[PDB]
């Protein structure tokens, strides 16, 4: 398993952390990072 959290723009790879744990990625200095979908299941109307 192993739950993710954030992700790298380029070297896209589950990451995560928290306050003061820096901001960069565990590799690409590229200090961006997305938050990735919710485990929670979204739903939609087929129209």
């Amino acid at each position: 398993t192993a739950t993710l959290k954030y992700i790298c723009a380029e070297c896209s790879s589950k990451l995560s952390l928290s306050r003061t744990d820096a901001v960069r990625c565990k590799d690409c200095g590229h200090r961006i990072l997305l938050k990735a979908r919710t485990k929670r299941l979204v739903q939609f109307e087929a129209r």
């Binding site: 299941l41 739903q43 939609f44 109307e45 087929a46 129209r47």
Partner: protein, 270 residues
């Protein structure tokens, strides 16, 4: 020699069309049917999508929308109540069909998602329903969407009853044809012409099946409408014929529900 009034005369046939010459009826009727066929014949299509994972480029609802247009089977249908009427808190095999769908970009070279890939999970109860109508050559039908390397897409679709009045996806119709009095002996039109009405305005394939004008003769003011050249196509879900009988039927039922009301209505009072 047989049958009351309305009488067809199938001109041609096709797994996807029914060029027929429905003659001797009220235009009203001809149309009233046409209409029914278009928007009120029950069908079945996805109507609920449960995005678990999506890395595509088509954001959820984008896909969720197409998924609803994806023609699904419905030969039976009539043995699958409208989720709404059913008693199951929400839905069940008694009212709906569930499908799955998952794709990953293994082929580091555009992996495609096709309607064929849907996977019926709920008990089909044993009855032609829920099968992604396919009229594809290589048997793939309806390219849902594409994806690259690590693109993933996990869904859960839930198709229910429904009719075109609620949304098109439940349209078994596709596009019907209609025409009558191919010469206009009734004058239901007033051809716009620069010079020769007969020149500028093309004649129709249907002129043949009906006696041309004949200048001499005056004007028929008792002229009515009989013989209507229709062409019910289809999208699959229902066989081009059903899209016609069920049309002849669906309508019919309603036309009766009116009596049904005329009855229930009387019984009442003190």
């Amino acid at each position: 020699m047989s049958e009351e009034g309305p009488q067809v005369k199938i001109r041609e046939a096709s797994k996807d069309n029914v060029d027929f010459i429905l003659s001797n009826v009220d235009l009203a009727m001809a149309n009233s049917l046409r209409r029914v066929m278009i928007a009120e014949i029950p069908t079945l299509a996805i109507d609920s999508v449960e995005v678990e994972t999506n890395t595509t480029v088509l954001a959820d609802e984008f896909i969720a929308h197409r998924l609803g247009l994806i023609p699904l089977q419905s030969m039976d249908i009539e043995q699958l109540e409208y989720s709404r009427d059913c008693f199951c808190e929400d839905h069940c095999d008694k009212c709906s069909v569930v499908l799955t769908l998952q794709a990953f970009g293994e082929s580091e070279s555009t992996t495609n998602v096709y309607s064929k890939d849907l996977v019926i999970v709920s008990n089909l109860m044993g009855r032609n329903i829920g099968h992604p109508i396919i009229q594809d050559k290589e048997g793939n039908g309806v390219l849902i969407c594409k994806l690259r390397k690590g693109q993933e897409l996990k869904l859960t679709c839930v198709a229910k009853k429904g009719i075109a009045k609620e949304h098109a996806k439940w349209g078994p119709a596709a596009a019907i044809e209609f025409e009558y009095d191919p010469w206009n002996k009734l004058k239901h039109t007033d051809y716009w012409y620069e010079q020769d009405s007969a020149k500028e305005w093309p004649q129709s394939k249907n002129c043949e099946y009906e006696d041309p004008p004949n200048e001499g003769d005056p004007f028929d003011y008792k002229a009515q409408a009989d013989t209507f050249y229709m062409n019910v196509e289809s999208v699959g879900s229902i066989p081009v014929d059903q899209v016609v009988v069920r049309g002849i039927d669906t309508l019919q039922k309603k036309v009766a529900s009116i009596l049904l009301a005329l009855t229930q209505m009387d019984q009442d009072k003190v």
